[model samples]
Target: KRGAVDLIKTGVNEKAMAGAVFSLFKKDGTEVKKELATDANGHIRVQGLEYGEYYFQETKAPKGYVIDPTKREFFVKNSGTINEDGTITSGTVVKMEVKNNEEPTIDKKINGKLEALPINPLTNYNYDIKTLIPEDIKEYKKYVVTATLDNRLVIQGKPIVKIDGAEVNANVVEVAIEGQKVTATVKDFTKMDGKKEFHLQIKSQVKEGVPSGSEILNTAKIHFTNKNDVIGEKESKPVVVIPTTGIIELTKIDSANKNKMKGAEFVLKDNNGKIVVVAGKEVTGVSDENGVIKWSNIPYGDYQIFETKAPTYTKEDGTKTSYQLLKDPIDVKISENNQTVKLTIENNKS
Candidate 1:
């Protein structure tokens, strides 16, 4: 009597787990095949076997997966015929499936959110990269994490490496920041617990040249050495940060004659009446000779415009008088990309 059998190996995502090694044995622990390595299709087939009870056990696992320790038993007999597709003719031969588990994952974040938005230019922000540390770190030659940020982003400082919540020493993980790219490599597992999460934080800023409302994408990839001594990588969901701004054009005018007035000084404030800060400085404006004070690259938000200093002008009669400040602050909203809001404020004699 003759028989045949086939088994397919799959991993966490039901992806074909190739390079898995298996060994076949008879019911009495008699060796049938000493080694049967799975093909690139994650398939293992045994044919021309004596019709009898037999079993298979995983001898070695594929890359990035835990080995299956359980035995798969089956009876191959003349009652079944093996088809070209490697499936049985609905008889005694068994079609088996094996699964393995992986223990690594990655995610990147900025400004406490996955995809940070409403950001201004030339400002520093922290980047948080989180990933899982597989318990089998000893099995890997090295673990690598490459974080490539959008070209428009400028690296601010070195990265901070942490496991779980505690920061690790620089020797524990070698971090390299090349321009806008950051790479963290762990070559020593002795100090690592693998029971906690791997975390890396970096400081970066968007370049001033980056256009408003620009989508800056960041890609983080996790790589490790697998059982087959090969490097394997998996990419995390892409995270993005958008830089946007608006323009505020203020035209100072005389309250009575409606003539352009110069030397008008104002302070921009938030909705809460707190002074606004732009590019790390208080937002204060002073009208020029043209009676125009334009504030460019202001972050989008509702703001209250408060006149700090009234302007002194010479009228047709050559009489010099200071314009009176408005009683209440004017409210404006910068709600669009590169939005321009023109405001004409009138002042009179106090």
Candidate 2:
């Protein structure tokens, strides 16, 4: 039970290719031929044919598989025939190898699950080929298919048409920054052909002329200079400073009320949270007999004053544990000529 039939291996690709089987055309060119069945793994065995001159070729390629067409025309001839006992003696077997100009087709998909990916046509871009074969695929291994890139290609790490997850070691064009876009490409070394595609994405953060304080201007876009410049360099911008001025005053505490707190200090700050002025800038006076202090010559911006000092402590057992006083940051505005600013510093030390 044997006849002329086509035999082929399958690929990990989805579609009908994994194990596609086709029957060869019998000697007559116009007549239809018998069909062959493939095994679960895409292996084929055809039956019912009188051994003669037969040339079998794969009509359509299995998905993810192009014809190695390089290997075609396998010859099979039976040596013995069936006798009266329905049994033959010895038989003859010959192996013929014909060349088919075919390569394996790949889908630039993430897990080789999407079928419509390859039909969209590839761009001039580089793709990262990935493989996702089951563990049982030890018998049917996977290979890498490299595709080169051109000048118009954009390199996006996205797994759109490019193999995304599996690991493939092949020659590919790396994406470079050209003004506002990232461009890249890869070469197909296995096929020795120029079949390629580019997957593009909009670059929103690679431009220049970002708005500062005034208005929108020409933004700076990232531009890749060399093909080898995959990673870029770093830099810094200059700082702009605003000038300012301020003043202050202090009150003297009478000897009768001057307890452990003998002196105090104050501080001034700017809008950007920077201290520029300190106590004794304009005048100096001790905490008055009523512990009251005054200040002047302050600028127009956010500010804070400090009272950095505390009273001395003594224990009844003839020991001392003097502590320091730290005041909270104060906020105030010094508008114009000699704007009188008042303050109170008393009993801050606990």
Candidate 3:
């Protein structure tokens, strides 16, 4: 009696795979069907075969999947019945369940030690692209990783490429930065046998005046060669960062006269006493005619305000005397998103 066979193939997520080529053979190692491929539905059907033992050998795997080097064996026997609906019953037919293995893919991450969102502008902004070595990476001719950083951010240095938690030599993994884009290439992947992971770390800073509450996006791409010598990008998951900023407003007054004082100069400094420079120039606030100074669009951080120059008033004797300066710097902190800190400073007549 004759029998029928049905073959099914899928990918890592049980997704139907097409263009997977296979060869059917008899028990005596005689090829029965060549160029047999799973169609768009990842299925193949064969009928009217003598009731005996047969096997299917994977000839080539679909793109982005690893090929299996084993044969899937099944038996077609004559002990059964056939149904009118064309669905075989009992032992008249054989079905093969074949699933292909997936290859390693690259990943994207921002601020590896902290959350990716709600990132403050003017703070340490870092990101990394990472992927593990697939068992068959050596089969590829070349590999490369590229990252596109947001234009609103500036990179600090060329990206650092590492393998197995250690930085690789510049000659081994050449890394380049072109403004907001970074590219890293592998010189010889065969030499990277013992390494497990490939990582490219980039340090950057969000430019000043980028409005908070909106998101900034970053992406990475992996391109590698196949047996066909073709190279194309596999997209990595994108990461986001929300730029944050705050406001500071100050009022200057003369304590002796209890009157608003103009011409008072103030300079802003960070927690480490480093003068703050944003967008281009150093941040300095000069009191206006109304004796008020406001710094807007400033990134969130702890800052100090000091009177760089004291305002002067004419004494009754027609002599010029300066108002007493504040002895200590005012400590102001932007603790939350869209926060504002208001301060009032007074000086005695001296």
lDDT of 2 by residue, 89-204 (tens): 23443322222222322223222232111111112222223222221222222222223222222334432323232222335434345543333333332332223322322212
TM-score of 3: 0.68
Residue 146 miss distance in model 3 (angstroms): 0.6
lDDT ranking of the models = 3, 1, 2
How do the predictions measure up, each by TM-score?
0.64, 0.30, 0.68
Please give the clash total of every predicted structure, in order. Answer: 1, 57, 0
Candidate 3, backbone clash total: 0
Compared with the true structure, what per-residue lDDT tens digits does model 1 show for residues 1-350? 67778788887557888888999999999888977888777888777778788889988878766565678888886655565456455456667898775657788888657575557677788888888776556566768888878778888878888888888777888898877779999867777644457898888888664667777777788887744465667787767777878889999877777888778899999988799877578889999877899988777789999988888966668898776677899998887643789988777765
lDDT of 3: 0.79
Q: In angstroms, what RMSD does candidate 3 have relative to the true structure?
A: 6.8
* lDDT of candidate 3 at residue 151, scale 0 to 100: 85
Residue pairs in clash, model 1: 324-348
Q: Which residue window of length 10 is worst by lDDT in model 3? A: 79-88
Identify the runs in model 2 with alpha carbons over 4 angstroms from their true place.
1-18, 26-37, 67-71, 79-183, 187-350
Query: Using alpha carbons, what is the TM-score of model 1?
Result: 0.64
